[PDB]
């Protein structure tokens, strides 16, 4: 099918803030069979970095030659598998008896496991401050650097809130300035409050990460397990971001306590097999001056949303 895929990365490869963009680059790189090439030939990967080209503000967009926009990794894969022309290796096409389970596994990573990667990308304070908020300086344009990571951190807080976590000013001014003793110990109140409340949060994250990876791995062991599916590329792109963050060795410590190191190192050698592949299957472009996201081409798009 003929279209143009819009992603989040820069200069050769997808960004770590978008696990759906990483899985799509691995999807297009792994379409090596003739029926797998038949649904991927002429897709024109563009790293445009603007969600204004999306129907819902998410940026694996498939803008396809008519105005037909299919957005998100699971929607694109279900769309591209529907347009197989019809008539083993590096990517399998599921049969008709397994289309429901493989869509169930793709949707389960999308709604349960990818919820936890956006926790560790925005709501982990070690990962957000060191890595994530200073990553949009290289992706976006000169004024629009500080509103996008604040939005995605607000959206990750709404998606994760139910599983993971002026007289009072005049009081302490008449107390702690009249103390000068728990003046300095006033901040010792709240950061000693915060530290055992943050190990509180990391325990209920890591219980929710442990159950969602266990639920997916037990259902994945119903299809063929020696072959690569679309469900695996979205699952492995979630480990690749979570184990590759600044706080990513906390997770690899805990994931071998539950699943072992003969499974975490079998999943990390599949990931490193996918990152170190050539971009010969990748047919790329540069964003034109309708697709960039500049100061002038995001004021036209802002005025178009209210007209």
């Amino acid at each position: 099918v003929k279209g143009s895929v819009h992603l989040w990365g820069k200069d050769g490869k997808a960004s770590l803030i978008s696990v759906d963009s990483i899985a799509l680059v691995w999807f297009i790189k792994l379409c090596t069979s003739e029926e797998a090439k038949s649904m991927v030939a002429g897709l024109q990967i563009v790293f445009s970095n603007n969600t204004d080209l999306s129907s819902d503000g998410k940026l694996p967009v498939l803008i396809l030659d008519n105005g037909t926009k299919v957005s998100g990794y699971v929607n694109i894969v279900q769309f591209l598998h529907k347009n197989i022309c019809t008539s083993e290796e590096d990517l399998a096409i599921v049969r008709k008896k397994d289309r429901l389970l493989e869509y169930s596994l793709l949707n389960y990573v999308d709604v349960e496991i990818s919820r936890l990667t956006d926790y560790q990308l925005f709501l982990n304070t070690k990962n957000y401050n060191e890595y994530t908020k200073k990553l949009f300086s290289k992706l976006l344009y000169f004024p629009m650097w500080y509103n996008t990571p604040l939005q995605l951190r607000s959206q990750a807080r709404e998606n994760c809130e139910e599983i993971i976590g002026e007289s009072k000013a005049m009081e302490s001014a008449s107390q702690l300035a009249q103390s000068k003793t728990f003046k300095i110990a006033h901040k010792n109140k709240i950061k000693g409050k915060q530290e055992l409340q943050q190990v509180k949060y990391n325990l209920q994250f890591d219980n929710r990460l442990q159950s969602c990876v266990s639920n997916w791995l037990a259902a994945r062991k119903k299809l063929d397990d020696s072959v690569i599916l679309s469900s695996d590329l979205l699952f492995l792109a979630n480990l690749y971001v979570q184990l590759g963050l600044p706080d990513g060795n906390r997770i690899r410590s805990k994931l071998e306590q539950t699943f072992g190191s003969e499974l975490l190192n079998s999943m990390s050698n599949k990931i490193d097999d996918f990152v170190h592949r050539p971009s010969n299957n990748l047919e790329q472009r540069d964003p034109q001056f309708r697709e960039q996201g500049n100061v002038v081409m995001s004021l036209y798009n802002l005025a178009c949303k209210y007209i």
Partner: protein, 299 residues
């Protein structure tokens, strides 16, 4: 604390007009004392044409209703202190979502919609493959149904299913004139509360943000048509793969009670929302399955 020098019996005068409204909205599951009975709060109730039962007009409320009849061995109501089913407003909760469960009288517990969803998926959490299908119906088939009923049906079809406001035939009374004005004034606020139930507002932030807004511009209308077309294309693929998942070995599974509760509410819509047209024409095996699943809860 000797100061109330006389205390009387509590006070036993009740508003009889309130007790007639509650009896109008109450439906009784047949087949314990005062305190072991629960009331299921539902959006509305429709009469099934085939059996004559009183089913809830929403797939989530109907699934909880079928799961309550299965767990306790009840019989569906017909459109001495038995349990009950209440037709309620969404506004009976802070959460504004309405499968809710009202258990007890003096020690009365209220389980909200999030609480029942945790209770319902905890009974299938041991089987991992059934949890994937349950998550697929509650996300992909759910989001189609909500978008077909918020955006593709008329306001009268929505308020027929998702409102406890009264519905007569036609306008003959001045009381019918302002009941027709509540269904136009309040239809949008009832649609906005429905988008906050299964975290639909977080999966679909931009089409929910275009709801909360006047004049509905052309850019918002063509982006909405792209999302709703992908949601419907994905849901024909769900519904066609569900047709090879209907064999039974005894009691219905909670997945089978969730498949049946979606088909029974899609085939109750009176408008061609394209989910009804697809299920009636192509999913004739799913329609017969939902009739077989329901008739082991009737008498």
């Amino acid at each position: 604390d000797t100061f109330p020098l006389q205390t009387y019996a509590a006070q036993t005068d009740k508003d009889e007009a309130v007790a007639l409204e509650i009896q109008r909205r109450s439906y009784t599951f047949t087949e314990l004392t005062v305190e072991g009975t629960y009331k299921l709060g539902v959006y509305n109730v429709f009469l099934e044409a085939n059996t004559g039962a009183a089913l809830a007009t929403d797939p989530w409320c109907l699934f909880v209703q079928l799961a309550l009849c299965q767990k306790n061995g009840l019989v569906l109501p017909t459109h001495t202190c038995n349990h009950e089913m209440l037709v309620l407003s969404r506004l009976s909760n802070p959460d504004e979502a309405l499968p809710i469960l009202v258990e007890g009288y003096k020690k009365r517990i209220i389980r909200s919609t999030v609480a029942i969803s945790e209770i319902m998926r905890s009974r299938i959490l041991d089987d991992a493959e059934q949890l994937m299908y349950y998550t697929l119906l509650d996300t992909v088939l759910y989001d189609c149904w909500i978008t077909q009923i918020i955006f593709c049906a008329s306001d009268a079809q929505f308020m027929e299913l998702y409102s406890c406001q009264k519905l007569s035939g036609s306008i003959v009374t001045p009381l019918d004139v302002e009941n027709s004005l509540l269904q136009k004034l309040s239809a949008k606020s009832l649609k906005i509360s429905l988008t906050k139930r299964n975290k639909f507002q977080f999966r679909h932030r931009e089409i929910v943000k275009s709801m909360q807004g006047v004049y509905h511009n052309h850019h918002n209308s063509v982006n909405q048509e792209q999302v709703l077309n992908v949601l419907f294309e994905n849901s024909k693929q769900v519904l066609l793969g569900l047709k090879d998942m209907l064999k039974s070995d005894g009691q219905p599974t909670y997945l089978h009670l969730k498949i049946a509760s979606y088909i029974l509410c899609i085939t109750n819509v009176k408008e061609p929302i394209k989910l009804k047209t697809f299920v009636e024409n192509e999913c004739k095996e799913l329609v017969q399955f939902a009739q077989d699943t329901l008739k082991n809860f009737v008498q």
